[PDB]
């Protein structure tokens with residue numbers, strides 16, 4: 001069921017990255033889930049999926065978006081202003097949630113670009129992570145200026161008091177404090193595990209992968225070929241849980 | 247890889263973003279459907295990317311159909327080459343997206359998005375070793391009708407194959423006469439593509455080649471597996487679909 005949402009704020013982080021804040025009578029959701037946003041464009045209802053950034057129970061629904069220049073809906077969401085109406089599906093969907101994650105010593109959460117949101121909702125909620133000894137959050141972007149949620153990421157790192165390790169990855173420039181390259185290369189060379197201080201192996205880890213579908217594909221391929229890791233299904237458990245954004 | 251120096255003979259733009267790059271270079275003979283790598287020494291590296299030959303093997307005008315990727319590293323630099331510029335070229339082609347790897351079938355379907363039409367154009371311009379296929383289907387899927395850069399070549403090929411080759415163009419963001427509207431998996435699932443071409447896409451009749459946009463390749467393979475019971479092809483474990491992803 002669609003419901004009418006009210007835009008409270010659009011905040012731009014760069015010329016292309018922005019966060020959209022909404023009030024809408026949605027149902028409770030599980031951290032990691034997504035809903036759909038909708039607008040009427042040229043007489044047609046256009047809808048896309050967007051992950052909740054906010055923890056469940058935060059009434060300020062938050063979405064981390066990138067403007068796709070030739071896209072249908074994202075440039076229109078990008079022009080929303082406080083007070084504008086946006087349609088929101090009241091029932092969330094998705095299985096990219098903690099309750100579906102197998103037990104493991106280390107939960108790796110890998111995200112590209114604007115796909116960070118499910119992890120932020122999970123980590124801001126802060127519940128049901130006791131059974132994991134280690135948490136690792138990796139945000140991979142083109143440029144350091146694209147690390148829009150680095151302040152929250154550092155606050156979360158502080159609050160988890162050493163359980164959560166954060167690592168930023170910047171692929172198109174070299175910046176102090178970040179690894180340079182793409183995630184598959186960084187896994188294969190040992191760079192990511194050296195920087196984080198933890199191994200990513202079948203004996204220790206479960207790996208969640210969110211965002212760029214070619215990154216998800218290539219990382220799963222590499223983990224399968226070199227780490228003997230398998231894709232996870234609820235009915236057929238494995239080491240790798242993925243959510244593709246397109 | 248043995249790099250050789252190539253000479254740009256021409257860059258020809260078809261739209262603001264689509265162009266063909268023409269090169270002379272001492273490359274080895276290649277098999278139609280294969281690709282080489284082009285390189286420029288820029289940005290403190292030898293930036294190199296794979297590009298499919300559009301030309302038939304034996305055509306000395308090496309031809310590459312490219313799209314300018316807005317924030318891309320190499321494609322905007324290739325797009326600003328001029329006659330007489332040097333471009334580096336790997337002399338030995340690579341790739342298995344070639345006829346000798348295609349299982350026997352009644353109908354060979356060749357589906358391409360965007361600038362991934364090149365391997366099929368090289369195969370179909372060469373025109374050899376297609377006797378074992380009864381029917382050939384060439385599908386070019388693009389966003390806008392203006393993006394059908396090789397439509398005149400496709401029409402001449404359609405004429406020269408005297409009916410053996412069926413061509414269909416697909417345009418996803420507008421409705422234009424002569425083209426189907428939408429995305430290839432949707433056109434397959436509704437029967438519209440097959441109705442337009444007049445041939446079925448089934449495991450009994452077809453092998454399907456998929457070239458270009460990796461999501462389209464992924465989604466088309468998924469649809470065909472789920473609804474036509476097709477499998478991915480490996481030389482050692484034959485199946486019904488052969489893919490070449492462009493990223």
Ligand SMILES: Cc1cc2nc3c(=O)[nH]c(=O)nc-3n(C[C@H](O)[C@H](O)[C@H](O)COP(=O)(O)OP(=O)(O)OC[C@H]3O[C@@H](n4cnc5c(N)ncnc54)[C@H](O)[C@@H]3O)c2cc1C
Nearest residue numbers: 034048049050051064065066068071072073074114245246
């Ligand atoms: C479960 C799910 C959750 C999603 N969550 C988010 C989210 O939190 N934030 C978000 O920005 N998008 C998210 N997406 C993607 C989103 O649904 C849209 O596809 C995106 O907003 C583009 O829509 P569009 O109509 O503008 O472009 P379309 O014309 O529908 O899409 C065309 C192209 O947009 C590009 N694209 C789409 N999404 C992204 C992206 N995230 N980053 C970079 N390029 C992209 C791809 O190149 C794609 O081929 C999610 C998708 C799914 C399925």
Ligand SMILES: Cc1cc2nc3c(=O)[nH]c(=O)nc-3n(C[C@H](O)[C@H](O)[C@H](O)COP(=O)(O)OP(=O)(O)OC[C@H]3O[C@@H](n4cnc5c(N)ncnc54)[C@H](O)[C@@H]3O)c2cc1C
Nearest residue numbers: 281295296297298311312313315318319320321361492493
């Ligand atoms: C076997 C093979 C054959 C290829 N043949 C061709 C060809 O004939 N013509 C061609 O234009 N490209 C072709 N490609 C893609 C090509 O190698 C490059 O990736 C492309 O030119 C962009 O390079 P870049 O340095 O500009 O971009 P990068 O910054 O290195 O790439 C980033 C992004 O560019 C986009 N992109 C890459 N290729 C394409 C494409 N073809 N269409 C749309 N978006 C794209 C994707 O979004 C990709 O993530 C081929 C790739 C392979 C593996």
Ligand SMILES: NC(=O)c1ccc[n+]([C@@H]2O[C@H](COP(=O)([O-])OP(=O)(O)OC[C@H]3O[C@@H](n4cnc5c(N)ncnc54)[C@H](OP(=O)(O)O)[C@@H]3O)[C@@H](O)[C@H]2O)c1
Nearest residue numbers: 016066112113114140141142143171182183212214215218
């Ligand atoms: N200029 C910018 O910084 C910027 C920022 C946001 C959005 N945009 C616009 O929006 C689009 C880009 O969105 P985005 O940058 O947020 O997302 P993106 O293109 O998915 O890039 C996110 C990250 O994923 C990496 N990646 C891509 N393919 C990969 C693969 N196969 N394996 C591993 N890693 C891979 C990229 O590395 P690579 O860098 O090597 O691709 C990058 O670090 C473009 O249309 C662009 O115009 C631009």
Ligand SMILES: NC(=O)c1ccc[n+]([C@@H]2O[C@H](COP(=O)([O-])OP(=O)(O)OC[C@H]3O[C@@H](n4cnc5c(N)ncnc54)[C@H](OP(=O)(O)O)[C@@H]3O)[C@@H](O)[C@H]2O)c1
Nearest residue numbers: 263313359360361387388389418419429430459461462465
């Ligand atoms: N003016 C233009 O329209 C134009 C044309 C060429 C190049 N460009 C630029 O170059 C890039 C686009 O290049 P391109 O148009 O050559 O290639 P592309 O984005 O790969 O699109 C080629 C075709 O693939 C289809 N497709 C995409 N994802 C699919 C999927 N999951 N399943 C099935 N089909 C799918 C597209 O349909 P959809 O339309 O539904 O995505 C389109 O018909 C952008 O940066 C763009 O700005 C612009």
Ligand SMILES: [Ca+2]
Nearest residue numbers: 058059060061
């Ligand atoms: Ca608040």
Ligand SMILES: [Ca+2]
Nearest residue numbers: 068246459461
């Ligand atoms: Ca795209």
Ligand SMILES: [Mg+2]
Nearest residue numbers: 212214315493
């Ligand atoms: Mg890309």
